[PDB]
Amino acid sequence: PGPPGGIRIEEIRDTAVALTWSRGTYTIQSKTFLSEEWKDAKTEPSDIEGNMESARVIDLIPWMEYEFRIIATGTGEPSMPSQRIRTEGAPPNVAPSDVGGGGGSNRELTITWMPLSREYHYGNNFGYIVAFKPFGEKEWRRVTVTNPEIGRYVHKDESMPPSTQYQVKVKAFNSKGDGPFSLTAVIYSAQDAPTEVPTDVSVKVLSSSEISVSWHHVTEKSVEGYQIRYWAAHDKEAAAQRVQVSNQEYSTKLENLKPNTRYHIDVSAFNSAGYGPPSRTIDIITRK
Description:
Layout: E1 7-12, E2 16-21, E3 27-31, E4 39-40, E5 43-44, E6 54-58, E7 65-71, E8 85-86, E9 97-101, E10 108-114, E11 127-134, E12 141-145, E13 152-156, E14 165-174, E15 177-178, E16 185-188, E17 199-205, E18 211-216, E19 225-232, E20 241-246, E21 251-254, E22 262-265, E23 268-271, E24 274-275, E25 282-285
Antiparallel strand pairs: 1-2, 2-6, 3-4, 3-7, 5-6, 7-8, 9-10, 10-13, 11-12, 11-14, 14-15, 14-16, 17-18, 18-21, 19-20, 19-22, 19-23, 22-25, 23-24
């Protein structure tokens, strides 16, 4: 039949809205950002006679934006959408997924989780509360994160020993209340960066474009490799080139250097928490 006329919004709850409309020369569909497609909607009454100009759409998502249109019968053109409305909010009903963490620089405890999509926000002023305690303790430390779009918190505590075992978890929340906590993950705090320096560093000019850099290994168990910085005289130190080798290398050959050119050379130790102090700078000239 004909497309039903305009739509009037009668009531808005968190999971349902009441509707009334004008006659068309019924069935209801809804729409959100989830799809440009319209979804057939459930109602009260479950079935709508042509007799009635009103109905109530149900099982809507809290704090979601909705449009609605009406269809008459047989199976004529759908109506123009109603004005876009937003359902009332409720406490979030899903916990954050993919919870873990680890690493970071000295004295950090980095905690991570997958952020809930807008779809799950369920209310105004959405956020996350992060909870964590040293393994086997009584009390949790809570911190609030007002960033619905970030899945990371970094806790800083100078007292924290390196690789301290921790119990951690995350829940969502909005102005209406708290969502369910996530699974409890076991993460370790950041390890300390190496503090010692590569000793006995030497550089052997091999050619017009190559030098060999050698050094003595440090003894810290945590060290994972060594970084060799090299920059020329006419360069800023912070614009240096770099090479990284495993902790099982005592030397490395640097290629593609410019001929007859003064080069500064560096060696430092590193692990997952960053770089230790570099060796005293050694200068050389490449061959002509």
